[PDB]
Nucleic acid binder design. Structure first.
Lengths: 64, 74
DNA sequence: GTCGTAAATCATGC
DNA sequence: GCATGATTTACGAC
């Protein structure tokens, strides 16, 4: 009937540093997204999608 | 982290979620309105219905040679 | 952009 | 000791 990558759980340092940036701005610039990618060993896409998910997490937590 | 305050659902509610699941083998995807009503009978938030059907879909798929054919439904 | 997911993984219940 | 609910990556809809 109805029946692109293996999910990699990020490091504590990877995730925590991403969280600091989110507290400043939930939406970050394309240049800083490149910066986040450089220091935290991530691709440009993965840093982008992380902020996509973290944003929805706020809407999921703060909801009624 | 609500994984710390996690508890098993009522056995009655499980009989409802499994009722919708197996009966709709062709399309195991409840609508926004269906999930809104499915959450009412079970005393759970809609997101928990989404989590259940999310978990139940994949964990169903893993079983291809077990008595997962609990489609007694009807 | 968001929103519904598949999926690996998590944390706990028993 | 797995069953199970909730969370975390990752991607395609739109």
């Amino acid at each position: 009937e109805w029946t692109r990558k293996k999910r990699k759980p990020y490091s504590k340092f990877q995730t925590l540093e991403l969280e600091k940036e989110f507290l400043f701005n939930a939406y970050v610039s394309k240049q800083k997204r490149w910066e986040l990618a450089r220091n935290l060993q991530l691709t440009e896409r993965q840093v982008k999608i992380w902020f996509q998910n973290r944003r929805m997490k706020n809407k999921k937590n703060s909801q009624r | 982290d609500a994984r710390r305050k996690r508890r098993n659902f009522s056995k009655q509610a499980s009989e409802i979620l499994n009722e919708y699941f197996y009966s709709h083998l062709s399309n195991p995807y409840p609508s926004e309105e269906a999930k809104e009503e499915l959450a009412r009978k079970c005393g759970i938030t809609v997101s928990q219905v989404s989590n259940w059907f999310g978990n139940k879909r994949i964990r169903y798929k893993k079983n291809i040679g077990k008595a997962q054919e609990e489609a007694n439904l009807y």
